[PDB]
Amino acid sequence: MRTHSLRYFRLGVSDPIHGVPEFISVGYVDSHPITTYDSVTRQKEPRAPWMAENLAPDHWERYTQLLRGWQQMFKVELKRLQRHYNHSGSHTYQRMIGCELLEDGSTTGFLQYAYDGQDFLIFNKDTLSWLAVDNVAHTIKQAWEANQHELLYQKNWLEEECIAWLKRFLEYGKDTLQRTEPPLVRVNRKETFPGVTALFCKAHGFYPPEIYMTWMKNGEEIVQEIDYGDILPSGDGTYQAWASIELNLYSCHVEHSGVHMVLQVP
């Protein structure tokens, strides 16, 4: 197949002002949200139709009880982080865990933490060590690497448990995640500033969001000073992007789901 992934995020805000919750937890398959929980509703709920249809109520009941506990874990860890930094006020604490299923059958896993939106700890599952960015992170790291069995548990989840859950969600929502919608690609030409011509290569309508676009001069070397647009969500489940150059014969090259396209500029 193509490259798929599963990721769980956690956010903890100390002293949330007004509406902002104290704890949010959201899970994604690729760019699709699948599960959500937060300290206001205190319920683990589905965020994709094919998750609700294929998971029995007791799954949601059971992970609500865990997230309620993980909510409390996070609140406390954030408190000891601020104490270590001698920080008062409102600060944040984030965790990302997940795994990827590669096109060629190999796999990756990541488990990361962040404080005020910056890298704090990084797990290396192939050496079972935590990488720390500063002296505070080094303190937490020492406690975590003291517990040999938990480091082994973390590795087993990232290589086995996570990849099994991802394969399960893939099947549950295959009509969504494995579909392919090809890009609609056009080239626009326009004289902008006296003597400058701007060539724009626009794509839209495609899914999955991963697409390659580039400009080539005389068929061989890529042209320099290309400008790239972000791959933006269009709102209907598909995506758009572009690339532009200024200025021989030029051509746009688009590659998407194993189909190459070439748009020669007149």
Epitope: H59, R62, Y63, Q65, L66, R68, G69, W70, Q72, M73, N147, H149, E150, L152, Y153, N156, W157, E160, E161, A164, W165
Partner: antibody
Framework: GQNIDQPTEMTATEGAIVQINCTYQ??????LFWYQQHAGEAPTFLSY??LDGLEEKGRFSSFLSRSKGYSYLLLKELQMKDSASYLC??????????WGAGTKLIIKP | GVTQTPKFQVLKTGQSMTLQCAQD?????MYWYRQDPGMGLRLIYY???????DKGEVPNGYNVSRLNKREFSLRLESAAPSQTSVYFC??????????????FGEGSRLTVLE
Amino acid sequence: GQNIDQPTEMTATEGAIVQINCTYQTSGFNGLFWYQQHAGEAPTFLSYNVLDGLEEKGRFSSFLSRSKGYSYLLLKELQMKDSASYLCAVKDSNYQLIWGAGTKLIIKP
Amino acid sequence: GVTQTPKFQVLKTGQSMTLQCAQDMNHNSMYWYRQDPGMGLRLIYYSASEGTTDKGEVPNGYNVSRLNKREFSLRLESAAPSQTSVYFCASSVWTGEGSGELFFGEGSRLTVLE
């Protein structure tokens, strides 16, 4: 998951070696525990395995095989004081323990 | 470590019973189990952390109250003979961490008669 199976009773001679098997069929696997329970008393932790290998804590070692879905608890130089029940438990993919019904170990002197 | 009471108790059918369990370990998860011959521990109720509880394998006939981080009560609403069993309270540091083990209390041998 559903099933965890361990023999009901096992008997061996003091000074010898006994091995207690626990085979498990569960949906997901987040670890395997061995607990010791002397008759009349409460269980106590002995061993945790989540990856393949053998781990030794003195006279007791515990072994996990992931592709084969079994563990065994192995005791060397059996003393009489090792008469007890050995409970085997597996955390499934939802972190719920599944408990085996225990193995009563009898030691002939 | 983990303390529960009483060690023994006789009950006439229909009576009420409350089993007490307390731990000074700063543990978050606590469990109520019963142990009957020929089968493994069956969970009655658990509390993943202070402020929540949920049912387990065999909840009918009981309810639980997580009073504070340290204490977790088991109440028998209207005792039946089939509730004769040995009762075990246990705690762990957190439910979610896959490696952590259970610490068990001494047990409550409880016999129910007509």
